[PDB]
Amino acid sequence: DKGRFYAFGRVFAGTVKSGQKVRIQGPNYVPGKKDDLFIKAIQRVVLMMGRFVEPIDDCPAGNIIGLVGIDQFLLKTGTLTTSETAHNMKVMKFSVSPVVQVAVEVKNANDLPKLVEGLKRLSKSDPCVLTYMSESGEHIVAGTGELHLEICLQDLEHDHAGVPLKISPPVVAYRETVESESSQTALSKSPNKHNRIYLKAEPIDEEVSLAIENGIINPRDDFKARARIMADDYGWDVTDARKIWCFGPDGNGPNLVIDQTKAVQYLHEIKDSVVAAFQWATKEGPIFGEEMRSVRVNILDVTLHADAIHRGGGQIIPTMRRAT
Amino acid sequence: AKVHGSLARAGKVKSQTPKVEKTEKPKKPKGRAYKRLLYTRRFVNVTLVNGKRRMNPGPS
Amino acid sequence: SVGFGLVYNSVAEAKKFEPTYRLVRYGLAEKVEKASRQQRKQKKNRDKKIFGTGKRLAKKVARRNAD
Amino acid sequence: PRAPRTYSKTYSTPKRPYESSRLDAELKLAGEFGLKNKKEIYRISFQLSKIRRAARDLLTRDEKDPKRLFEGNALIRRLVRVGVLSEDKKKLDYVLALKVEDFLERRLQTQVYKLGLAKSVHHARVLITQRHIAVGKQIVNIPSFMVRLDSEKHIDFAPTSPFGGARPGRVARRNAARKAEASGE
Amino acid sequence: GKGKPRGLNSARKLRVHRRNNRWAENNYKKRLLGTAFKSSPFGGSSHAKGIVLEKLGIESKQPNSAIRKCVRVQLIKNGKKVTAFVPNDGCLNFVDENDEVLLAGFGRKGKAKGDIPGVRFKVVKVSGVSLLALWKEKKEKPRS
RNA sequence: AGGACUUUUACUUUGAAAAAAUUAGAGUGUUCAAAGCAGGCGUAUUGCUCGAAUAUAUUAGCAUGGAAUAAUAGAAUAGGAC
RNA sequence: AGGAUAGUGGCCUACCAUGGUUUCAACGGGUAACGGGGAAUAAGGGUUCGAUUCCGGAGAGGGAGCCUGAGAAACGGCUACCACAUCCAAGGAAGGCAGCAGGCGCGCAAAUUACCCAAUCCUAAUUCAGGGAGGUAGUGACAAUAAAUAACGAUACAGGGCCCAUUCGGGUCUUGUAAUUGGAAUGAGUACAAUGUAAAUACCUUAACGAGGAACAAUUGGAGGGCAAGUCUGGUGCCAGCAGCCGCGGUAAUUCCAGCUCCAAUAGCGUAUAUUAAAGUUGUUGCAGUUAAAAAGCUCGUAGUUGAACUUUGGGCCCGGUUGGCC
């Protein structure tokens, strides 16, 4: 009725009240912080009857009960204590966790988004069923077992989204990268024949590439202090260590572009073009437009035609991508 | 125009700003009691007049 | 204190015109009362279905219960 | 279905939001008349305008006309019974003139301060509100009571609160019990 | 003379002529045709609730440079396409696609607020909590 | 006034014509004010009285006056007035 | 002419004439259209709104029909269809909340299934009955009016009056900032009792408790300009974002985000949309048309709008009202 759903929990201590002030100690909530905290007001309480219920306004410690109205504020499964100093209970176990996996779309793409609220509806229909996004524009659906997911698929099917759905195995992506180093120095200039570019790519240490994805090397860290951490701990060149230029892609990717020119008085004039074009590159790679991971760049010697009018973004970006 | 803009940088500012709390500032008069505070310093105690007239300055 | 007094010629003419609430607020008569309005309106329509006293109909139901 | 409790606004904000000149004179008015809301000064000018208006309309009509006399005279003689309008000027031309200062110079607050009483102007307001002073004995906690003169000599601490008899304060009674509790037997 | 026939028996004459040149008036047209109750995404209405579909990254027209962070939505009362906008720093950190919304205008009566291309509707509430609460941390977003 | 036939309109004058509540607005210390339409005074121990005004009440319509103004008509093979 | 009707009449039916409406916009269409009273805004002139406390109007899910009755096309009456929608033991039955609450849905959006006839009035045979009309309380920031969050001493102490000055200046009028402090002043509350009420809570009353910054704490917005009020600090580095327009940031930003100080208004301010003034940016008042947006290519000519002068004008008498000296 109306689209509202009463929570289901056991009383561990205290007596429930119809409109009682209690605090929600979510799965990440901790007394010493404030995250996952929600001190709200219940509308009323209800006692179970197989498939239907009846409004009981109070219930004692140890006896299981139902707290209706707090639905749109909790976090699916959580602790509800009115005592602030209270620690966080044990966070279940289950022993299953997502393993089954499919992809969902429509036979009629004009009502496609109605299918997505059907997906959020499934989250709000089962306990251990987990619906999420794929790094390739598909709505991966995972769960307990094959039938489990299929019943959850029969749910998404008739009930929740209630429209035609296309199911396929979860379409993967395999991080384009490199085994060896650029054999020789790759050369490339503007379509408007002039200003050239020279580089070579090498295999970065996942020890440090993972250090990117763990807060050690940040695209905006201490070129001086972080130099000590990558020269003494990661055995790199503290020279180009402070010469790092960009994290491709998204501005924090496992790929980096590095300065190594000497006689180029006008290199800084094309950097913006380089960093953003380096992104379009680490975005869609040659092989099959797959993002890169642990891919480094050594910008050797780059000549730029006299004035910055021909040495501009409009034609440098196309060169860099092609040089990379 | 550009629909697929990168949003991994959004919120940068209100993220690493030096967390500086609000120092102990004594309560100020509210309402009629306020016009009292204003009027006594805005006219009764007055301020400078370098050229024509000024108000809230800076440290120099 | 702007009030409003009423001096009746007699106490007899009091329990004649004088509205209940005032004289009852004093303590002249006893707290006269009937069930709440919700009991009264509900009881009103239940008696509006039944025709006449019809205690033979309450006895008619005492028939479905033996048959 | 009852009936209209006819509402209407007494003040009127300016066709301008931050006119330097206009704001400086009105803040000095809240220090000379101890007010707090421009609405309180606006309210004055609004009633001041309604006045000035009807005055103007009546002022235009053919002199000797029953209206210019009825609505006029009767009006004038009221702003007077409140002591705002000068006795000498009885040709509704000082009314057209006037200024907020004058209408505001006849408020319970300005007279409560001028008739000594609460020393400072503001301290005068601190009392009006804390139940004190009265008319014929009709106590008031309305700092903007509009003294009308025919009530100016009756201004004094009403039979309630100290400085006019009655029972003083609860902190004083507590001070009496706090005095006999410290040293006594 | 000069134009308008200053006559005593040319009332309706000067009337028609007037109503006519009234159509050349901008805001008069929008009313005597119900442009709002037909085209305007918020057909004759002020604000409106909907459903967030995509977290767009709308560009900024000259001469300013930077991404704005708008959101294309499908309104509940129409479903018509509206490429909305979102105020304050971040927000998108606590917005999330497919959430409840309530939009309004840019005091432009259509038109773009300025540098933001075409975007004619910005956000106010989300999940029924509003930015300020989540922008000043006076509450956290529910299970919406 | 039983009676006989009369140039009309438009314009303008005062009144009238009207449901109030609302507008302006009389007056009156709701403690003040939007209000409200109440009160004010006496032998406060057997009551006296002032109120709860007027106007706009807009267009058409109605009644008197005006006769400037926009018109309008009248005697021609005399369709003549007395 | 008759019929039908309470009654006039193409209201309807015979028989007859060819007519009646129309550029003074009929007819057709839209209406985010109940009209009128009236509301919002105001210099005048207009403009926009008026579902809504009242009045006339219309309907009760969408219809059409009709009993009774003075009165209904009633639906808290009924019959049938349509759409519905509920009960069942399966044969049947009943029902419209655009009446009061209330539930879903619809939504930007809109309150309690609480009390009661005491008021106001009505209905009835009719003082006594009844009235989810209406009256009250709850919820309530649609508007509206009043106004708490303290004020006086006060001590260290400089400023601006002064009778006083070689220059060792007291102190003399006080203006405040005072991390010393000092007591009265208090409704917001709480609570005997009474008041109020149909009953009670609250308005108005009042014992007893109730103010010293940790209180009983007021905020929303803004500070380049426009528009009153910082070139001050810390991070930001045309990113994040602001930006009602113009316009800010690309490593010293008066416009970012936080500090601090401060400002416009104040229990209201900011938001959006709508409408008015602005706007003489809608024009009778009162615009523009040579180039700025705009004189039809030219003339004729309707309808419309509009159109010379000329008709007892002028002179004389007397009187009744209202202003002022004046005597």
What is the 3-class SS of E119-132, one letter each residue?
CCCEEEEECCCCHH
Beta strands in chain E (DSSP E): 48-54, 70-75, 81-85, 100-104, 122-126
Q: Is the CB of D9 under 7 A from strand G?
A: yes
Q: Is the CB of E62 under 7 A from strand G?
A: no
Q: Which residues contact E51 (CB under 8 A, 6 or more apart)?
A: A113, A117, E73, E74, E76, E98, E99, E100, E101
On the question of a cis peptide bond just before residue A249, with omega within 30 degrees of 0, the verdict is yes
CA E119 – CA E84 distance, rounded (Å)? 6
Q: Is the CB of D49 under 7 A from strand F?
A: no
CATH value of A1-92 in 3.40.50.300, 2.40.30.10, 1.10.260.40, 2.60.120.650: 2.40.30.10
Interchain contact E144–A (C-beta under 8 A): yes
No. of helices (H) and no. of strands (E), chain A: 7, 19
How many C-beta neighbours within 10 Å does residue A204 have?
Answer: 22
Q: Which residues contact A48 (CB under 8 A, 6 or more apart)?
A: A66
CA D76 – CA A239 distance, rounded (Å)? 93
CA E86 – CA E89 distance, rounded (Å)? 9
- Position C32, amino acid: V
On the question of a cis peptide bond just before residue E63, with omega within 30 degrees of 0, the verdict is yes
Token digits of residue A227: 């130099």
Q: ∠A165-A169-A170 over CA atoms, to 5°?
A: 100
Question: Please, which chains are in contact with A (at least 3 CB pairs closer than 8 A)?
Answer: B, E
Q: Is the CB of A2 under 7 A from strand G?
A: yes
Length of chain A: 324
The closest of B5, E142, E74 to A115, measured between CA atoms, is E74
Classified as helix, coil or strand, D1 is coil
Classified as helix, coil or strand, E102 is strand
Token digits of residue A299: 């910008």
First to last CA, chain D: 69
Which chain A positions have a beta carbon within 8 Å of E140's beta carbon?
35-38
Specify the experimental method: cryo-EM
Residue with tokens 């491709």: A248
Query: Residue E3, exposed/middle/buried by CB under 10 A (0-12, 13-18, 19+)?
Result: exposed
Per DSSP, the residues of D84-139 read: -S-SS--SSHHHHS--HHHHHTTSHHHHHHHTSSSSSHHHHHHHHHTTB--SSS--
CA A25 – CA A38 distance, rounded (Å)? 7
For A219, the closest chain B residue by CA position comes to B9
Token digits of residue D7: 């509402």
Q: How far is the CA of A245 from the C1' of G91 (A)?
A: 89
Token digits of residue E74: 């499908």
The closest of A294, A291, A137 to A211, measured between CA atoms, is A294
The partner residues of E73 in beta bridges, in order of sequence, read: E52, E82
Per DSSP, the residues of A4-31 read: -----EE-SSS-EETT-EEEEE-TT--T
Q: Is the CB of D174 under 7 A from strand F?
A: no
Phi and psi at residue E84, to the nearest 5°: -60, 180
Q: How far is the CA of B30 from the C1' of G173 (A)?
A: 32
The closest of E43, D177, E144, D18 to A75, measured between CA atoms, is E144
Token digits of residue E22: 């009234």
CA A204 – CA A177 distance, rounded (Å)? 10
Q: Do A251 and B8 form a contact (C-beta atoms < 8 A)?
A: yes
Token digits of residue D78: 């009221």
Greatest Cα pair distance in chain E = 74
Per DSSP, the residues of D17-35 read: S--HHHHHHHHTHHHHS--
**Which chain B residues touch D if contact means CB-CB below 8 Å?**
31-36, 38-40, 42-44
Q: How far is the CA of C3 from the C1' of G194 (A)?
A: 14
Q: Taking a contact as any Cβ pair under 8 Å apart, which residues of chain B between 22 and 41 contact chain E?
A: none
The partner residues of E54 in beta bridges, in order of sequence, read: E72
Domain coordinates in residue numbering, chain A: 1-92, 93-175, 181-324
First to last CA, chain C: 73
CA D79 – CA E71 distance, rounded (Å)? 62
- Position B1, amino acid: A
Q: Residue A86: how many CA atoms within 13 Å on its side-chain side?
A: 18
Classified as helix, coil or strand, C26 is helix
Query: Residue B29, exposed/middle/buried by CB under 10 A (0-12, 13-18, 19+)?
Result: exposed
Count structural domains, chain E.
1
- Position A218, amino acid: N
Classified as helix, coil or strand, E107 is coil
How many C-beta neighbours within 10 Å does residue A227 have?
Answer: 18
User: CA D168 from chain center: how many Å?
Assistant: 28
Q: Do A208 and A221 form a contact (C-beta atoms < 8 A)?
A: no
Q: Do B43 and D27 form a contact (C-beta atoms < 8 A)?
A: yes
Structure letter (DSSP) for residue B40: I
> By 3-state DSSP, what share of chain D in percent is helix, strand and coil, each rounded to 5?
50, 0, 50
The partner residues of A141 in beta bridges, in order of sequence, read: A102, A131
Token digits of residue B15: 């993220």
- Which of B2, B3, B14 is facing E90, going by the closest CB pair? B14
Sheet containing A37-41: give its strands across: A37-41, A21-25, A79-81
Q: Taking a contact as any Cβ pair under 8 Å apart, which residues of chain A between 47 and 106 contact chain E?
A: 71-76
Q: Residue E1: how many CA atoms within 13 Å on its side-chain side?
A: 5
- Position D60, amino acid: T
CA D144 – CA D35 distance, rounded (Å)? 9
Q: Do A96 and A128 form a contact (C-beta atoms < 8 A)?
A: yes
- Position D20, amino acid: S
Token digits of residue D13: 């904000």
CA A25 – CA A27 distance, rounded (Å)? 7
Token digits of residue C29: 């008569």
Q: How distant, in Å, are the alpha carbons of A84, A242, A299 from that of A302?
A: 63, 19, 7
Q: Do D56 and D68 form a contact (C-beta atoms < 8 A)?
A: no
The closest of A225, A226, A207, A217 to A253, measured between CA atoms, is A217
Which chain D positions have a beta carbon within 8 Å of B42's beta carbon?
27
Q: Is the CB of D181 under 7 A from strand G?
A: no
Q: Do A161 and A118 form a contact (C-beta atoms < 8 A)?
A: yes
Considering all nucleic acid strands, name the nucleotide whose C1' atom is nearest to the C-alpha of residue E10: G305
Q: Do E78 and E113 form a contact (C-beta atoms < 8 A)?
A: no
CATH code of the region A93-175: 3.30.70.870
Q: Residue A3: how many CA atoms within 13 Å on its side-chain side?
A: 3
> By 3-state DSSP, what share of chain E in percent is helix, strand and coil, each rounded to 5?
20, 20, 60
Q: Which residues contact A318 (CB under 8 A, 6 or more apart)?
A: A190, A191, A277
Please state whether E142 falls in left (phi above 0), alpha (psi between -120 and 50) or beta. Answer: beta
CA A90 – CA A79 distance, rounded (Å)? 9
Pairing of β E48-54 and β E100-104: antiparallel
Token digits of residue C16: 């004649």
Cα torsion A157, A162, A163, A167 to 10°: value is -20
Residue of E61, E67, E86, E135 for testing the chain B interface, max B β-carbons within 10 Å: E67
Q: ∠A90-A92-A98 over CA atoms, to 5°?
A: 145
Residue with tokens 């499919």: A102
Q: Do D60 and D27 form a contact (C-beta atoms < 8 A)?
A: no
CATH value of A181-324 in 3.30.230.10, 3.30.360.10, 3.40.50.970, 3.30.390.30: 3.30.230.10
Phi and psi at residue E54, to the nearest 5°: -135, 145
Q: How distant, in Å, are the alpha carbons of A183, A200, E103 from that of A180?
A: 8, 11, 54
Give buried/exposed letters for E94-122 (b at 16+ CB in 10 A, else e). bbeeebbbebebbeeeeeeeebbeebbbb
The closest of A75, A164, A175, A81 to A127, measured between CA atoms, is A75
- Position D153, amino acid: K
Q: Is the CB of D123 under 7 A from strand F?
A: no
Q: Do A131 and A176 form a contact (C-beta atoms < 8 A)?
A: no
Q: Is the CB of D142 under 7 A from strand F?
A: yes
Token digits of residue A295: 């891919």
Which chain E positions have a beta carbon within 8 Å of B6's beta carbon?
57, 67
Pairing of β A255-259 and β A244-248: antiparallel
Which chain B positions have a beta carbon within 8 Å of E92's beta carbon?
7, 10-11
Structure letter (DSSP) for residue E93: G
| Chains B and A touch, contact meaning at least 3 pairs of CB atoms under 8 angstroms apart | yes
Q: How far is the CA of E12 from the C1' of G22 (A)?
A: 18
Token digits of residue A17: 């009240």
Residue with tokens 């003169």: D149
Q: Which residues contact B30 (CB under 8 A, 6 or more apart)?
A: none
Q: ∠C40-C45-C48 over CA atoms, to 5°?
A: 130
- Which of A35, A72, A116 is facing E143, going by the closest CB pair? A72
Residue B13 C-alpha, separation from nearest chain E C-alpha, in angstroms? 7
Pairing of β A255-259 and β A295-299: parallel
Q: Is the CB of D17 under 7 A from strand G?
A: yes
Residue of E75, E99, E140 for testing the chain A interface, max A β-carbons within 10 Å: E140
Q: Do E126 and E141 form a contact (C-beta atoms < 8 A)?
A: yes
Q: ∠A298-A301-A305 over CA atoms, to 5°?
A: 130
Token digits of residue A165: 């759905």
The closest of A171, E50, A78, C39 to A67, measured between CA atoms, is A78
CA D13 – CA D46 distance, rounded (Å)? 9
The partner residues of A22 in beta bridges, in order of sequence, read: A40
Token digits of residue E125: 């509430």
Q: Do E104 and E121 form a contact (C-beta atoms < 8 A)?
A: yes
- Position B8, amino acid: A
Give buried/exposed letters for D59-85 (b at 16+ CB in 10 A, else e). beeeeeeeebeebbeebbeebbeebbb
The closest of A283, A252, A279 to A173, measured between CA atoms, is A283
Classified as helix, coil or strand, A299 is strand
No. of helices (H) and no. of strands (E), chain D: 9, 0
On the question of a cis peptide bond just before residue A113, with omega within 30 degrees of 0, the verdict is no
Q: How far is the CA of E8 from the C1' of F7 (A)?
A: 25
Q: Is the CB of E133 under 7 A from strand G?
A: no
Residue B25 C-alpha, separation from nearest chain E C-alpha, in angstroms? 20
For B8, the closest chain A residue by CA position comes to A250
- Find and list the nucleotides of strand G having atoms within 7 Å of a protein beta carbon: 24-25, 30-32, 40, 42, 48-49, 53-54, 103-109, 114-119, 130-136, 143-153, 175-177, 183-187, 196-199, 205-215, 217-218, 221, 223, 227-232, 234-250, 256-267, 271-276, 281-285, 287-289, 295, 304-306, 323
The partner residues of A25 in beta bridges, in order of sequence, read: A37, A79
Q: Which residues contact D128 (CB under 8 A, 6 or more apart)?
A: D108, D109, D112, D140, D141, D142, D143, D145
For D40, the closest chain B residue by CA position comes to B32
Q: Which residues contact A223 (CB under 8 A, 6 or more apart)?
A: A241, A242, A244
Considering all nucleic acid strands, name the nucleotide whose C1' atom is nearest to the C-alpha of residue D3: G53
Q: In sequence order, which ranges of chain A are alpha helices (DSSP H)?
A: 112-123, 146-158, 206-212, 225-231, 238-241, 271-283, 313-323
Q: How distant, in Å, are the alpha carbons of A106, A270, D72 from that of A151?
A: 18, 56, 89
CA A141 – CA D169 distance, rounded (Å)? 75
Q: Do D84 and D52 form a contact (C-beta atoms < 8 A)?
A: no
Token digits of residue E101: 């919304």
Structure letter (DSSP) for residue C18: S
Q: Which residues contact A317 (CB under 8 A, 6 or more apart)?
A: A273, A276, A277, A280
